[PDB]
Paper text:
Sdk1 and Sdk2 are single-pass transmembrane proteins, with extracellular regions composed of 6 N-terminal immunoglobulin (Ig) domains followed by 13 fibronectin type III (FNIII) domains, and a relatively short intracellular domain terminating in a Postsynaptic density/Discs Large/ZO-1 (PDZ) binding motif. These four domains adopt a horseshoe conformation, like many other IgSF cell-cell recognition proteins, but they interact in a unique back-to-back anti-parallel manner not previously observed. Overall, our data suggest a model in which Sdks form cis dimers on isolated cell surfaces, which dissociate to form trans dimers through the same interface when contact is made to a cell surface expressing the cognate Sdk.
The dimer protomers are related by crystallographic 2-fold symmetry in both of the Sdk1Ig1–4 structures, and by non-crystallographic symmetry in all the other structures. Although the Ig1–2:Ig1–2 interaction is present in all of the crystal forms of Sdk1 and Sdk2, there is a difference in rotational angle between the two horseshoes of the dimer among the crystal forms, with the Ig1–2:Ig1–2 interface acting as the hinge. This results in differing levels of interaction between the Ig3–4 regions in the Sdk1 and Sdk2 dimers in the different crystal forms.
Author numbering:
A (entry chain A), B (entry chain A): 1 to 379
The structure:
């Protein structure tokens, strides 16, 4: 047919992590009446001009190729945006070539930050001192951000600490320089030290359907053997999902029933001390989905009114953005194309140049969906 | 601790398709008390011996590297099988270097098979004759297996046909040699020809949650302009999901409500001819999931009875296979390890050598899941 508007035969696949040096083949698998042309876009910037080549090939990936890719397909009838593809590249930088020094007063917690290093994705970190692998315990913690936390420090904890960082996707590993931790005398004259939260749990947001999410709370106290960290929800202690000496709470398969405030509570068992508390809030993201889509093809007569419906649901409420032939409506500046509050597109007096592909995108923090129609105008 | 049995920190990811020549990095991301050792397996065959290296790296993938990979992790306490990883490699072979000949009698359908070619995944095929791209129409069909079907042949259809095959994953393309189709005179003396099904729909099975599934039915008749192909279910014609001149029925998001028999029906409109019919059956596969798992760690006293529960649901009913320290129970040939019909493992008189990792796999055609426990035996 001479009247087949462009459409995609296959949608691009889920985000995959790619290795430096590997070949990458992107493809624009579209059909339609010909001349059929394709161009590529990276980060809303034009990579290629229009031609009959539907492939975009990177012979050897480097880190600067990481980004969002999409093709546009066009024939005489209109232009259609492919849904975005997320191309991540696994890479591991270097540690800065310098030692660091840190001093803490006996009895306080020492928080040793993982030395600056750029890595995708974030590495797995093993902490060392004098070739001895440091294992989490009731007194030693390693945060979700790979920081080493030594609780209730003593003179024995002084020394030179370092990391082996491993990028699990490309296999590369790096050793950091030293952090020289010194431990000075106790502040004042106090044997026991009340619980104090040194790593507070953060606000957490997770996308619906995710397997797990983990909150973390680390407290200092002395004697550390009496220290108890526990998690409360709705004023009542939680009993399941606890890990790493009670410092990690993992919620599995989180739904909206698990949203809201969580409280971690640190106590010295049997003591007269007040507990230390910190609050964290858990939020669920519902990716967008359409509740009203237009027909694939619509015929209007010149001079009549046209309505193209598009409505989407999600948490948070999705924002809708319209395109005509792969140009956003804001750029076209067409006073006859009215966007309705519910989301639909209203066209007051159809004109022959209104013919083409209208495309609606709904997006929030947790995803993006698309629907489109070919508008045909007669006479 | 000296008593941490091996466990995985991260499960391997979903099946990805890899390109020839690309680097591949597999990783065995397990923790536990050390010495901790790892070995790799490809297609139930041992690739490497046990060592402290948790990575397996293929510098440059070739087709013969395609297969199922998994690591075993072991310390003194026991051995644990990683869940399998499916490594497919995109490849495209060559057509055989020979022309073919085919003769059909005028009015009959000509079924032109795509010339033998090994390819992963199956290529996208465009059929040609004299440089002219052949487009599907009411008289020309291209099956889901890339065969060209010319209905109600005429002398004009004689000529040399060929294909451009494109592997969409690695971008490679091949042109085939020619099929020389000849069209001989009509058989007998008949103007109209009743509908006959030349490509019958097949039994289809699909995994639950799949986006789409498509059935295909192609009929011959003359005059082809009067030919109508339609789909029936429960004795009543289906109205939605039809494609390619009614020859394709796509069921979107198939559930068990769509299982059973579908009928395609070919008629010559307004004619006295009987319809031609073919039946196809659609089946849904439910991947396995557990309905009863054992605790992560279990303590038995010597000489007592132990029960390790494992029960799974799925369509078809999953089969359960047990392992101890990554050795299947059938090999161990231990008369004290009894497998119950519901799935659980029964151990009559616990002995010290029963300590270790017991691992239960449930599988059917649509997936495989695993659960495990560390059995500790005292005294
Ligand atoms: C394309 O856009 C992505 C998304 O913003 C960019 O990713 C950022 O890259 C910079 C480094 O250049 C980092 O500092 C940011 O943290 C990254 N943000 C995210 C969300 O990933 C990417 O660099 C862009 N690529 C190009 C070529 O423009
Ligand atoms: C973490 O999330 C909580 C929960 O929303 C935030 O608390 C809100 O803070 C604003 C800012 O003053 C208040 O006006 C609201 O009353 C709070 N909402 C609720 C439901 O209590 C908090 O600000 C967030 N903090 C960070 C650092 O992200
Ligand atoms: C590993 O097992 C898979 C699964 O059977 C093998 O895949 C088969 O490969 C042969 C060619 O060698 C094909 O003829 C079959 O059709 C394939 N079957 C499937 C289900 O994919 C794979 O070849 C095996 N690889 C090794 C190295 O043993
Ligand atoms: C396609 O599926 C149908 C549906 O199950 C199969 O029909 C069965 O065939 C057996 C073999 O003689 C009969 O005993 C059963 O009565 C049939 N079942 C039903 C529900 O009708 C058919 O054999 C399959 N054919 C192919 C080629 O796969
Ligand atoms: Cs649509
Ligand atoms: Cs378990």
């Amino acid at each position: 047919q001479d009247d087949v508007a462009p459409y995609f035969k296959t949608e691009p696949g889920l985000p995959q992590i790619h290795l430096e040096g590997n070949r990458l083949v992107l493809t624009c698998l579209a059909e339609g009446s010909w001349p059929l042309e394709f161009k590529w876009i990276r980060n809303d910037s034009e990579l290629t001009t229009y031609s009959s080549e539907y492939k975009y090939i990177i012979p050897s990936l480097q880190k600067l190729d990481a980004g969002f890719y999409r093709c546009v397909v066009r024939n005489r009838m209109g232009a259609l945006l492919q849904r975005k593809s997320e191309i991540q590249v696994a890479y591991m930088g270097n540690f800065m070539d310098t030692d660091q020094r840190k001093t803490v007063s006996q009895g306080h917690a020492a928080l040793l930050n993982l030395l600056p290093i750029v890595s995708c994705p974030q590495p797995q970190v093993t902490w060392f001192r004098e070739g001895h692998k440091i294992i989490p315990s009731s007194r030693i913690a390693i945060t979700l951000e790979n920081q080493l936390v030594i609780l209730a420090t003593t003179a024995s904890d002084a020394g030179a600490y370092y990391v082996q960082a491993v990028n699990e996707k490309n296999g590369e590993n790096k050793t950091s320089p030293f952090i020289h931790l010194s431990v000075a005398r106790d502040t004042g004259t106090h044997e026991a030290m009340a619980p104090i939260i040194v790593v507070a749990p953060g606000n957490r947001s997770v996308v619906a359907g995710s397997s797990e999410t983990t909150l973390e709370c680390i407290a200092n106290a002395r004697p550390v053997e009496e220290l108890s960290v526990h998690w409360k929800r709705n004023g009542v202690r939680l009993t399941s999902g606890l890990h790493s000496y009670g410092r990690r709470l993992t919620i599995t398969n989180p739904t909206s029933a698990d949203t809201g405030m969580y409280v971690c509570e640190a106590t010295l068992r049997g003591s007269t001390f007040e507990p230390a508390r910190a609050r964290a809030f858990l939020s669920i993201i519902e990716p967008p989905y359409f509740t009203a889509e237009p027909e694939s093809r619509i015929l209007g007569e010149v001079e009549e009114t046209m309505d193209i419906p598009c409505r989407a649901m999600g948490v948070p409420l999705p924002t809708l953005q319209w395109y005509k032939d792969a140009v956003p409506l804001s750029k076209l500046q067409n006073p006859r194309y009215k966007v309705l509050p519910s989301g639909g597109l209203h066209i007051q007096k159809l004109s022959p140049e209104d013919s083409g592909i209208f495309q609606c995108f709904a997006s929030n923090e947790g995803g993006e969906v698309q629907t489109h129609t070919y508008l045909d105008v007669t006479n």
